[PDB]
Amino acid sequence: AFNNNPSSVGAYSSGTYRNLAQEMGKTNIQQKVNSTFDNMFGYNNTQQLYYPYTENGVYKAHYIKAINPDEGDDIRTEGQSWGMTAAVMLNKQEEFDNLWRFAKAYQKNPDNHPDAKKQGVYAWKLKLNQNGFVYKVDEGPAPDGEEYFAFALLNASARWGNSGEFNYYNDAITMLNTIKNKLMENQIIRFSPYIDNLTDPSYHIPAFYDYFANNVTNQADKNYWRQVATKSRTLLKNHFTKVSGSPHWNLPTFLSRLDGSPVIGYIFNGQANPGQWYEFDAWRVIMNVGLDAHLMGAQAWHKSAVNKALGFLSYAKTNNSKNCYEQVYSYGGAQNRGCAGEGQKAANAVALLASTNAGQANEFFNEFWSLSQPTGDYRYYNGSLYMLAMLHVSGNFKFYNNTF
Numbered sequence: 484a485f486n487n488n489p490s491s492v493g494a495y496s497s498g499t500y501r502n503l504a505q506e507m508g509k510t511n512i513q514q515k516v517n518s519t520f521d522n523m524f525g526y527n528n529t530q531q532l533y534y535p536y537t538e539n540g541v542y543k544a545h546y547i548k549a550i551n552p553d554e555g556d557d558i559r560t561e562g563q564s565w566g567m568t569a570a571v572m573l574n575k576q577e578e579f580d581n582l583w584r585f586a587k588a589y590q591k592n593p594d595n596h597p598d599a600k601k602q603g604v605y606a607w608k609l610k611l612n613q614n615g616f617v618y619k620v621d622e623g624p625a626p627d628g629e630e631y632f633a634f635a636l637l638n639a640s641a642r643w644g645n646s647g648e649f650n651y652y653n654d655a656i657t658m659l660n661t662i663k664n665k666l667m668e669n670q671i672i673r674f675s676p677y678i679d680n681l682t683d684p685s686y687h688i689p690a691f692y693d694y695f696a697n698n699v700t701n702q703a704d705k706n707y708w709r710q711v712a713t714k715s716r717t718l719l720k721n722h723f724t725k726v727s728g729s730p731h732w733n734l735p736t737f738l739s740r741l742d743g744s745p746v747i748g749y750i751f752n753g754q755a756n757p758g759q760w761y762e763f764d765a766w767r768v769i770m771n772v773g774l775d776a777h778l779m780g781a782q783a784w785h786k787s788a789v790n791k792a793l794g795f796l797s798y799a800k801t802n803n804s805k806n807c808y809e810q811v812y813s814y815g816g817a818q819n820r821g822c823a824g825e826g827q828k829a830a831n832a833v834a835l836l837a838s839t840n841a842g843q844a845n846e847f848f849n850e851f852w853s854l855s856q857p858t859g860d861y862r863y864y865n866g867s868l869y870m871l872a873m874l875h876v877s878g879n880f881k882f883y884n885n886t887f
């Protein structure tokens with residue numbers, strides 16, 4: 484049965500990981516997780532997201548392909564880092580190494596870039612040119628990519644050691660220093676190096692920062708990352724307070740100020756959507772809250788955040804002519820951007836690790852578990868989240884500490 488009373492003590496401290504799918508009475512759980520990875524990482528052109536990159540017939544590395552029917556396929560740091568994360572959780576070293584080799588070679592901006600703000604950060608959008616060779620479309624970062632890269636690299640060090648192709652640990656510490664030096668304002672993750680007083684709630688994964696703190700080897704840095712963790716929980720708590728009730732109706736938003744206030748409308752040239760939309764990034768917020776509750780312990784704010792967000796989505800579904808909740812809301816109003824897809828349902832299933840409502844759990848969990856693995860033209864974002872959620876709901880998303 485669903486555990487509707489999640490522990491205040493996290494799995495990171497106790498070593499006890501929940502298996503949500505098992506709580507929900509499912510069977511063949513590990514087989515389903517394993518086939519999800521195999522199909523995402525297999526050469527089937529169906530669920531597949533993991534593709535080789537070759538130059539003049541010489542194999543180089545692999546990438547997570549951000550398939551995109553509207554704008555042309557591209558390659559993103561988020562997807563790359565998520566794929567590495569999935570690989571390390573399932574002990575898939577070759578896949579991990581192939582993805583990391585690509586990131587370090589082709590996504591990383593040089594340390595001597597003329598713009599100091601870009602030095603060592605990872606260009607968020609690459610493409611293959613008309614001759615098949617990789618190039619950077621946009622050198623600016625998507626900072627949760629660097630967050631996941633650091634996380635994944637620290638875990639790779641812990642599981643596999645540092646005497647193979649990569650010194651994962653050194654690569655991870657380099658990544659953490661890049662985050663600190665290039666991607667932080669006042670210990671809050673930036674949306675952009677070029678804009679102050681701006682964060683993206685979906686980038687806040689407080690438990691990652693606690694894991695970073697336990698995996699650095701100097702006291703100042705340990706304290707730094709613990710403080711980032713506390714400030715991240717504060718930001719999320721504040722954001723959830725600010726989106727409660729009217730006018731945001733309990734869904735977190737794309738962009739926020741450092742006090743948690745949603746950003747209203749457009750604020751910069753190039754911005755893809757209004758700041759106050761619950762959109763694709765925002766989907767991940769309650770997933771991250773579930774993650775944090777599971778790994779570091781459920782507090783009242785985690786439970787309220789998820790219970791109210793899921794409650795809104797259920798209500799919104801009852802007020803939808805398609806009998807679905809949608810992908811994009813603004814001020815509690817549907818924006819007609821489609822019924823929830825697999826990735827949104829996956830994010831919401833992970834959020835259940837902070838839920839106290841068994842009825843909600845039954846519904847959101849079963850809506851995820853009944854899905855087939857994403858295929859087709861929208862599978863990048865749906866399929867990447869589906870993979871992560873499969874790990875989270877099967878007890879496979881674990882923190883592996885390094886030993887000093």
Ligand SMILES: O[C@@H]1[C@@H](O)[C@H](O)OC[C@H]1O
Nearest residue numbers: 820821823824825861865
């Ligand atoms: O995310 C959606 C996806 O699940 C679907 O398959 O295609 C339409 C998208 O908007």
